[PDB]
Copies of this chain bind each other. A is one copy, B any other.
Amino acid sequence: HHHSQDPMLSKDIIKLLNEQVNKEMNSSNLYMSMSSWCYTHSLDGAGLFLFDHAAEEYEHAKKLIIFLNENNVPVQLTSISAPEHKFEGLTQIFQKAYEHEQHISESINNIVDHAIKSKDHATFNFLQWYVAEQHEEEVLFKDILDKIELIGNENHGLYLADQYVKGIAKSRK
């Protein structure tokens, strides 16, 4: 029976990275459920945007998995819990989403900080695409929320907001 090389990352980094894979998986499902809510409530602009965003979060999870694989680090996938499926409206969904993105940013900042502390610059260096893309996503959700709040809910507001989000969804493809 053949010997395979030990994991190339430290136990703490392994734990944080596996946690982050699972976080992105859970995020993807949350966005799918938010998307479905919009599609079933005549908001197909927000539905599309959120569907495409969900898909992109899963793409992040896969990229993290590739990095674990290349370092001989076992991927430890946990149970993914059922996402929230009940929502109040467009504004509430994007408020929740923006808060979620802020949490995701914090979690990445935490991994990068630990990489610095343990002098794991292979991991620091690898995470830079992820820091950059997440910041763009966070800024995007801030802007969409700003626009939704600016438009409001009075006559045609929901329509105008959804068409604004539709345009963003299409321009990002």
Q: A residues bordering B, Cβ < 8 Å?
A: 2-5, 7-8, 25, 29, 32-33, 35-37, 39-44, 47, 51, 55, 58, 62, 65-66, 68-83, 85, 98, 105, 108-110, 112-113, 116, 119-122, 124-126, 128, 131-132, 134-135, 138-139, 142-143, 145-147, 149-152, 154-160, 162
- For residue A151, which residues in chain B have a CB less than 8 angstroms away from its CB? 156, 159
A to B CB contacts below 8 Å, 8 in the list? A2-B149, A5-B98, A35-B75, A37-B74, A42-B150, A79-B82, A155-B156, A156-B156
Q: Which of B2, B29, B125, B139 is in CB contact (< 8 Å) with A132?
A: B125
Most interface-central of A85, A116, A156 (chain B CB within 10 A): A156
- For residue A109, which residues in chain B have a CB less than 8 angstroms away from its CB? 119-122
Instruction: Check A75 against B42 for contact (C-beta < 8 Å).
Output: no
A30, closest chain B residue (CB): B77
Instruction: Check B41 against A4 for contact (C-beta < 8 Å).
Output: yes
- For residue A4, which residues in chain B have a CB less than 8 angstroms away from its CB? 40-42, 146, 149-150
The verdict on A73 contacting B40 (CB below 8 Å), with A8-B142, A112-B119, A156-B156 known, is yes
Instruction: Check A131 against B125 for contact (C-beta < 8 Å).
Output: yes
Instruction: Check B42 against A149 for contact (C-beta < 8 Å).
Output: yes
The verdict on A40 contacting B142 (CB below 8 Å), with A85-B77, A156-B156 known, is no
CB distance from A167 to the nearest CB of B (A): 10
Instruction: Check B75 against A44 for contact (C-beta < 8 Å).
Output: no
Instruction: Check B156 against A80 for contact (C-beta < 8 Å).
Output: no
**What 3 A-B pairs come out closest when comparing CB atoms?**
A36-B75, A80-B80, A122-B135
Instruction: Check A2 against B152 for contact (C-beta < 8 Å).
Output: yes
